[PDB]
Structure 1
Amino acid sequence: ATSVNERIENKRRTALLGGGQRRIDAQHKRGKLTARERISLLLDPGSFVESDMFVEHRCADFGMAADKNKFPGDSVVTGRGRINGRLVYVFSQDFTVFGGSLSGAHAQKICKIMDQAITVGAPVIGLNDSGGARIQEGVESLAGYADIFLRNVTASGVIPQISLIMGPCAGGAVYSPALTDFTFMVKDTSYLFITGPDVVKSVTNEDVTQEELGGAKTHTTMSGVAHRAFENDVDALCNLRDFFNYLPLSSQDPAPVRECH
């Protein structure tokens, strides 16, 4: 009946709008901004070429084939671009659908971007925003984590890897930021903890909250995991720009030289 053009347009508009305008305004009023405009702001204007824009997750089990819980993009935005004229491979988790939970397509696209970057020799910037994992897919999803880890260990000392975390990351995915070189946070927006406060409350039996377990202040003051903490997101990206400007593209290139006076 209808041509494929209208279906493609509907898929594109649903991906841009996410799960609906209500979620969009709720996220805007929450205090943080989605991944697409973050990538637009981090890099130069009109220099971003996204790769594999149309990828969706498939799962025969649990009866998720309906369009109610089907969304293209797999809550990951990956691409390449130029900042100040220098090439960068950029990564952004997306919390609009499933809370940025990682799956097979997630890890597949992630591995594609990192091994392409290692081949060319450009740095890898990764913006992390997730809050859980799909329990329906199960152990298979865990396998993806393992794959991702390998890439990091293959790139240690070959290219600089920078990880900015700006969501309540938890579980087994807190290790990929820890295998990179420099870790930065945003105050009162990004959390790190391997296990949730409920588990420690049930087992160790003491009253603890999430702020004093995975807050930016705790990790940047006493835990010694992250390097700096920023007040919000736009300023975090502005600081990430010139911090990247400091560093070279790879270990083969020498230290950058800036005109001075």
Structure 2
Amino acid sequence: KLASTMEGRVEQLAEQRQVIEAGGGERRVEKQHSQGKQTARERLNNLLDPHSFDEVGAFRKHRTTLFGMDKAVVPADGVVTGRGTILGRPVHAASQDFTVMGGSAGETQSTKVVETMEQALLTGTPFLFFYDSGGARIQEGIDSLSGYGKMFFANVKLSGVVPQIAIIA
């Protein structure tokens, strides 16, 4: 239910963006931290120049429905993507959120990653990706398997055109 004024909706927007950014929640974030690991968003915030991150798909949602995916709430489908700068240089980046279903690669998540890579290719900028995952999302079966096929094809498409740096965290 949307607020009656633009001001209300903007405040409403802010509250919703916060929920998404909280990812899997306090307990899981505490567990990530207790393991000596930063969160998906801390990694991007630490890597990119202060305030340069421009996120794409924060509100993106999976469309899968089997084995409980129809009721599951999966913030950003487990990956934070966008563009920013490093020492002023434009870059595109992705960061898997292990707090959201173990960072398992959902179909939509992989689509978000590929679109970000396609933008790096299109604009001729480097691409950096923080990996933190249990692999293809089992509940989505072949839907998530397809996501990886597209990702691998994209990695090769970018190979030798723009630098690609992977960080397994």
TM-score bin, normalised by smaller chain: 0.7 to 0.9
Per the alignment, in what secondary structure is the counterpart of residue 73 of structure 1? Answer: helix
1:155 is aligned, of 153, 158, 163, to 158
Gaps of 5+ in 1: 167-261
Shift of 1:62: 2.4
Q: With the length of structure 1 as denominator, give the TM-score of the two structures.
A: 0.58
Match of 1:83 in 2: 86
State how 1:1-150 maps to structure 2 within 5 Å: 2-3=1-2, 5=9, 8-66=13-71, 69-150=72-153
Give the distance between the partners of 2:23 and 2:155, measured in 1 at CA. 30
Contact 1:11 1:72 in 2 (8 A): no
RMSD between aligned residues: 1.8
Contact 1:104 1:141 in 2 (8 A): yes
Q: With the length of structure 2 as denominator, give the TM-score of the two structures.
A: 0.87
Give the distance between the partners of 2:24 and 2:116, measured in 1 at CA. 26
Give the distance between the partners of 1:122 and 1:141, measured in 2 at CA. 27
Q: Percent identity?
A: 49
Contact 1:123 1:161 in 2 (8 A): yes
Give the distance between the partners of 1:71 and 1:157, measured in 2 at CA. 34
1:191-222: per-residue Cα shift (whole Å, max 9, x none)? xxxxxxxxxxxxxxxxxxxxxxxxxxxxxxxx
Gaps of 5+ in 2: 4-8
1:15-37: per-residue Cα shift (whole Å, max 9, x none)? 22223222222221221110111
Structure 2 CA distance for partners of 1:42 and 1:23, relative to 1, 3 Å:
same
Residue 15 of structure 1 aligns with an amino acid whose one-letter code is I
Contact 2:54 2:82 in 1 (8 A): yes
Give the distance between the partners of 2:160 and 2:133, measured in 1 at CA. 27
Aligned pairs, number: 163
Which structure has the bigger radius of gyration?
1
Residue 110 of structure 2 aligns with an amino acid whose one-letter code is A
1:134-181: per-residue Cα shift (whole Å, max 9, x none)? 222101211111111111111121111111111xxxxxxxxxxxxxxx
Deviating above 3 A after TM superposition, structure 1's stretches of 4 or more consecutive aligned residues are 4-11
Contact 1:89 1:122 in 2 (8 A): yes
